[PDB]
Design a protein around this ligand. Structure first.
Ligand SMILES: NC(=O)[C@H]1CCCN(C(=O)Cc2ccncc2Cl)C1
Ligand SMILES: [Zn+2]
Length: 139
């Protein structure tokens, strides 16, 4: 679990969105596993606007932050699950590191701010849904 709060927006994994998230829906994309809902309170997270390939992510299954090198956002095949059939997920970045299903929502950050959130994992690889291209989050 975990979300990004920027201005009047809440960014979450689409497979983990709540009834409230869907009732205050701004945008959602199944191919990216992302959903954005509106909020009454103001958010203070800073989104990075960069092409960084190094950062730090929070891993709840270990109660620890880990430094990682990660790939540029791309279409990567993701094995079937209870939330989606087998498909290519777009805007996905991979790193060598630990992750478990409950780790989704953990933030990945570089020196410029929030890069993305944990979205996939397995075989000693963790996947992050990139958010740096969503320029509208800041307006
Ligand atoms: N983005 C998706 O389609 C995910 C939906 C939930 C299931 N997905 C996983 O990868 C779950 C997983 C398994 C083992 N270790 C880490 C993780 Cl995050 C895929
Ligand atoms: Zn950066």
């Amino acid at each position: 679990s975990g979300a990004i709060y920027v201005g009047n927006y809440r960014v979450v994994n689409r497979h983990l969105a709540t009834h409230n998230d869907w009732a205050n829906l701004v945008w959602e994309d199944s191919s990216r596993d992302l959903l954005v809902s509106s909020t009454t309170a103001q958010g203070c997270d800073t989104i990075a606007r960069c092409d960084c390939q190094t950062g730090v992510y929070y891993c709840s299954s270990r109660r620890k932050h880990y430094p990682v090198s990660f790939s540029k956002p791309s279409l990567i095949f993701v094995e079937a699950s209870e939330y989606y059939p087998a498909r290519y997920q777009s805007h996905l970045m991979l790193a060598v590191g630990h992750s478990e299903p409950g780790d989704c929502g953990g933030i990945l950050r570089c020196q410029h701010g929030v890069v993305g959130i944990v979205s996939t994992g397995g075989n000693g690889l963790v996947g992050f849904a990139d958010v740096r291209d969503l320029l509208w989050l800041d307006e």
